[PDB]
Structure formats: C-alpha cells, structure tokens
C-alpha cells in the first residue's frame, strides 16, 4: 500500500471501473445522509 502516481492509478483503473449500477446499489446500502 502506497501513494499511486496519476499514471499508475489511471493504469490500474482503466478497464476496471465498476458498472454504473453500483451507484444504485450504494444508494440502497450507504445512501443515508446527515
């Protein structure tokens, strides 16, 4: 575990983004507001 460079992060993330539907699941599971 270390601080990733911009390029490193974007390399790890590209092709690995969650489906848009995760927003929906997270609204149900962790959408509780202040």
């Amino acid at each position: 575990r270390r601080w990733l460079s911009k390029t490193e992060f974007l390399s790890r993330l590209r092709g690995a983004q969650a489906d848009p539907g995760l927003r929906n699941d997270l609204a149900v599971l962790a959408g509780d507001t202040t």
Partner: protein, 126 residues
Amino acid sequence: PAAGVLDTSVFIAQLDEALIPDRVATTVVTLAELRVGVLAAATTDIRAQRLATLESVADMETLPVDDDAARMWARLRIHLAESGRRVRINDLWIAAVAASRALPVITQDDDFAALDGAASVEIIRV
C-alpha cells in the same frame, strides 16, 4: 495539487484526467463500499467487473478514519446542521479524512458540493 483523496464515485463508470493530482490515495470508506459492491452483485459478469474495481485499490494507500478525521467529521457535521445542508454520512467520513490531512477530495459525483468553503475542504470534480 500534489496529492488527493479519491472517493468511491471515481471508481465507478471518462474522467477529467487533467484535474487528478499527481499522487492519489483513497480511504477505508471506499474500500468498504467497493467490497459491498462485490458482495451485492446480482450476476457473475457484474461481480467480475466489481471484483476488478476492488482489486484496483490493492496497492493504493487506504487512509483510515483516525482521531484527526473523527474531530474533523464533528466540525463538518455541525457546519452542515447549522446551514441545513446535507451530505451522505459515508461521504462526510471521506471528506473528514481528506480535510484532516489537508488534502482535496477527488470526486466524479455531486455530493461534496454542500461543503464548499468549509475550512480544510477542497473538492475537485472530475
């Protein structure tokens, strides 16, 4: 800025790459949220995708909620209560962690907007 803290929305499906700081970390809140994503996935394809998303943070600094973040959360929470504005509680934990380290929150979504101008808060929308 030199460094920033990714929220959960940046991991979810292009981003404005120019605005991402040179060095990035995330927090334990996003670790939790990506993990619940894997466990909630309805079909193998979605599960495999979300599992890749979870794995993308394996090497990345995951910042904890420590004492300093806790103190910040209280300040930010009362700021919101007084103004009558709202933030998802888990997003407030993210903002508390980032603010307590004097780092900006990097976000793709619109939740952190309510905190603009609070001390130590800087929001970067990508």
